Structures are given as structure tokens and as C-alpha cells.
Design a binder for this molecule. Structure first.
Ligand SMILES: CC(C)CCC[C@@H](C)[C@H]1CC[C@H]2[C@@H]3CC=C4C[C@@H](O)CC[C@]4(C)[C@H]3CC[C@]12C
Ligand SMILES: C[C@@H](NCCCc1cccc(C(F)(F)F)c1)c1cccc2ccccc12
Ligand SMILES: C[C@@H](NCCCc1cccc(C(F)(F)F)c1)c1cccc2ccccc12
Ligand SMILES: *[C@@H]1O[C@H](CO)[C@@H](O)[C@H](O)[C@H]1NC(C)=O
Lengths: 283, 93
């Protein structure tokens, strides 16, 4: 009743509206059961469903030689990489726990490298530019992936990411974010991925007019251009958001890049294998 | 404002459909790639800025609109007219 001086509320706590009691601040963070979160995870699971449906189509018509002209075995690895890339989007929408922050970026990175490098190796005109005949493309793509695995492991060992609990932005609201520690290793990761994608884009830019399996080399170019557009428009969109809608933009870019890589590159085959021009496939 | 945005998005989708339908025209009359890439640039740029528009409301809420406009309309220009300008000037035929 008779207080000579009000005492400050402790950490993770705030005064009530009438300054009588103390209540805790809020754990604002992107999650499900939100008008933004539910639509986003719906898009992610839709991407997974489409990718799995395309994989099932490629398995069903596995003996038709439409798919046999582009390293059919490697296509399954590409589709699994697409599965993993789509799934990596669900890491940014969950609770930013300790393990989530240490893996959300490396997982999507390994997925996307296992995807772009697989596409780049897939080119049947570049496989030949005695450990070949049984497994030659797999080793070449695995070296490129392995480079990224080791840079990821050195980043995860030296300066592991941490779940930074930040409350400086809002005095009354606690924002659960993720800290990376050393940003130079993440910059190296992004630069290596972009360099691999640019190499794929350059290699596909010289074979646009060659109709190798339904003008596939042109759609490699289209997918790479979509990826570059997405990740160059993500730069201003990311350094503008302050709050819960900051893990919702990199995930949007991930969804856009994965859609551009999957639809543009596989729907050519899909619209001929099972659609009305079913009797248009030929060797 | 929501309906103003929705009508423009609907016309963009109709533009997508028209570009798809005009795919088989001869090279000089076929602009399906450029139209579809322009519409993709516009949609990607504006969709990526949704969290920024829905979260920030200070000085950045208008800078975001400025950069998004200067990106969408510049992408329209570059996709549509730049290739024709190059094929006219740099490589005349
Ligand atoms: C499915 C929607 C939602 C997104 C994916 C993009 C769709 C609309 C686009 C991307 C590239 C397009 C393809 C480009 C070229 C051809 C060759 C033609 O002989 C048959 C149609 C086909 C194969 C198009 C079908 C539509 C297509 C697959
Ligand atoms: C998902 C995306 N990075 C997310 C955090 C962005 C960031 C947050 C904070 C700082 C910085 C920056 F300073 F380093 F740029 C970036 C990503 C992940 C992995 C590979 C990638 C390859 C290509 C494109 C994107 C890649
Ligand atoms: C410049 C912009 N004025 C409000 C932006 C709202 C918005 C912010 C962020 C994303 C989106 C969108 F992606 F949903 F469109 C909209 C505008 C004015 C007039 C017509 C428009 C048609 C399309 C797009 C923008 C239009
Ligand atoms: C003032 O603080 C909160 C209002 O948010 C209320 O629960 C509390 O009972 C109020 N105390 C009063 C009116 O004495």
C-alpha cells in the first residue's frame, strides 16, 4: 500500500496496465495457427505433394525411354534433393530452439547444392567433356556436394549457431531469433551456392537451341534465372523486416526457388508422359 | 486497395494465359518468354515484400513500395523491350 519507491519488474517480466502487478513479456515468433504461418506451411506441404507425385510418375513410367535420355537414376536423386529442400522450409516456421537454428540454413544449403550440382552433372553432353560406366556422374556430383558438407561442418564445429533471445527491439515483447556467430562462413556458403548456380546457368546458356529431350537445356536456363531473380529480390525484402516476419521471407524465397527448379524442369516431361499427348513419347 | 491489387493480379494471370496460348507463333511474333518472365518478376518482387509491408510501418513502409515499383516496372521494360532493342541495334537483321 505505502510504497516509498516502485521497484523495477524483473527480466522476462513487465508491469501491468495499472502498474499494480507484474506480467511476463511475450514470446512473439513465427509459428503455425497464424494467418501467415498456416498458408505458408500449406504451400510447403503442397510443394512436397507435387514433388512426390512427380517422383511417383517418374517411377511408374520408368521403362519408357523418354526419361532414360537424361540419367534416369540421377533424376531420383534430384527428386529426393527437392524433397529435402522443400522440407528445409519447415525449419524457419517452428519454434527457434537450439537445434533448429544450428540446422535451418545448413540443411537448405546441402539440399540446394545436391539439387543444382545434380542438374549440372545431369547434362549428358558434359559427362564426357576405369572408374566410369557403373558410377561416374554420382562421384562428380558428390565431390561438389562434399565441398559444401565440409564447409558446413567447419562452421558448425567452430562457431555453432545459437538461439538468440532478443528483447532490445521491443521492451515489452521478447523476440526469439537465431544467431549464427561467424557470418563469414555463412557468406562463404551462400557465395559457393551462388557460384555453383551461376556455373550451371552458364553451361545451360550455351545449349538453349539444342532440343536435347524436349529443349531441357532451355528450361535449365529458365529455372536458374528464376532462382537468381528470387534470391536477388530477397536481399531488399530481408533487410526491411523487423520482427516475427523475418523467418517468413527467407522461407518464401526457398519456396519460390524450389518451385522454379521443380516445375520448370520436370513439367516438360510430366505433361507428355501422362497428359493427353501420352502417345507423343518416343525413343 | 485490396480490390485494386486483386484486379491487377487477375490481369497479370490473364497475361500469363495469353503468353502460354501464344507459344507456337513464329519467332518475331512469339513473346511468350518475355511476357511470362515479366509477370514472374512482378509477382516475385511483390510477393517477397509481403512480410515487409505487413510488419514495418515507419520510413521503410514507403521505401519498400518505391523499390518494389521500380523493380516490377523495370522488369516489365527489360523483359519486353530490351531484347527487341538489342536485336535491332546490336545485331541488325
Ligand atoms: C503448373 C503451374 C501452376 C506452374 C508451372 C508453370 C507452367 C504453367 C509452365 C512452365 C513451363 C511451361 C511449358 C513450356 C513449354 C511447353 C511445350 C509444349 O509443347 C507443351 C506445353 C509446355 C510443356 C508448357 C506447359 C506449361 C508450363 C509447364
Ligand atoms: C536461406 C538463405 N539464407 C537465410 C539467412 C539470410 C541471411 C541472414 C543474415 C545475414 C545474411 C548475410 F549477411 F550473410 F548475407 C544472410 C540461404 C542459406 C543457405 C544457402 C543459400 C544459398 C543461396 C541463397 C540463400 C541461401
Ligand atoms: C504500389 C502498390 N500500393 C500498395 C502495395 C501493397 C502490396 C504490398 C506488398 C505486396 C502486394 C501484392 F503482392 F499483393 F500485390 C501489395 C500498388 C498500387 C496499385 C496497384 C498495385 C498492384 C499490384 C501490386 C501493388 C500495387
Ligand atoms: C490493473 O492491472 C491489470 C490491468 O491490465 C488488472 O488485472 C489489475 O487488476 C488492475 N489493478 C487494479 C485495477 O487495481
Amino acid at each position: 500500500t505505502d510504497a516509498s519507491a516502485c521497484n523495477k519488474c524483473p527480466d522476462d517480466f513487465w508491469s501491468n496496465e495499472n502498474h499494480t502487478s507484474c506480467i511476463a513479456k511475450e514470446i512473439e515468433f513465427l509459428s503455425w495457427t497464424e494467418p501467415f504461418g498456416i498458408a505458408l506451411t500449406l504451400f510447403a506441404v503442397l510443394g512436397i505433394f507435387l514433388t512426390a507425385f512427380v517422383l511417383g510418375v517418374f517411377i511408374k513410367f520408368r521403362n519408357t525411354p523418354i526419361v532414360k535420355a537424361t540419367n534416369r537414376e540421377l533424376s531420383y536423386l534430384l527428386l529426393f534433393s527437392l524433397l529435402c529442400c522443400f522440407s528445409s522450409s519447415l525449419f524457419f516456421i517452428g519454434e527457434p530452439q537450439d537445434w533448429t537454428c544450428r540446422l535451418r540454413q545448413p540443411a537448405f544449403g546441402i539440399s540446394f547444392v545436391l539439387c543444382i550440382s545434380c542438374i549440372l552433372v545431369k547434362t549428358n553432353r558434359v559427362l564426357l567433356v576405369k572408374w566410369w560406366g557403373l558410377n561416374l556422374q554420382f562421384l562428380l556430383v558428390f565431390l561438389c556436394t562434399f565441398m559444401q558438407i565440409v564447409i558446413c561442418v567447419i562452421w558448425l564445429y567452430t562457431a555453432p549457431p545459437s538461439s538468440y533471445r532478443n528483447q532490445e527491439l521491443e521492451d515489452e515483447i521478447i523476440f526469439i531469433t537465431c544467431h549464427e556467430g561467424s557470418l563469414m562462413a555463412l557468406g562463404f556458403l551462400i557465395g559457393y551456392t551462388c557460384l555453383l548456380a551461376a556455373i550451371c546457368f552458364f553451361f545451360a546458356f550455351k545449349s538453349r537451341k539444342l532440343p536435347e529431350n524436349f529443349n531441357e537445356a532451355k528450361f535449365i536456363t529458365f529455372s536458374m534465372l528464376i532462382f537468381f531473380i528470387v534470391w536477388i529480390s530477397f536481399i531488399p525484402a530481408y533487410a526491411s523486416t523487423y520482427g516475427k516476419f523475418v523467418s517468413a521471407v527467407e522461407v518464401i524465397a526457398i519456396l519460390a526457388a524450389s518451385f522454379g527448379l521443380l516445375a520448370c524442369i520436370f513439367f516438360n516431361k510430366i505433361y507428355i508422359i501422362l497428359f493427353k499427348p501420352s502417345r507423343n513419347t518416343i525413343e
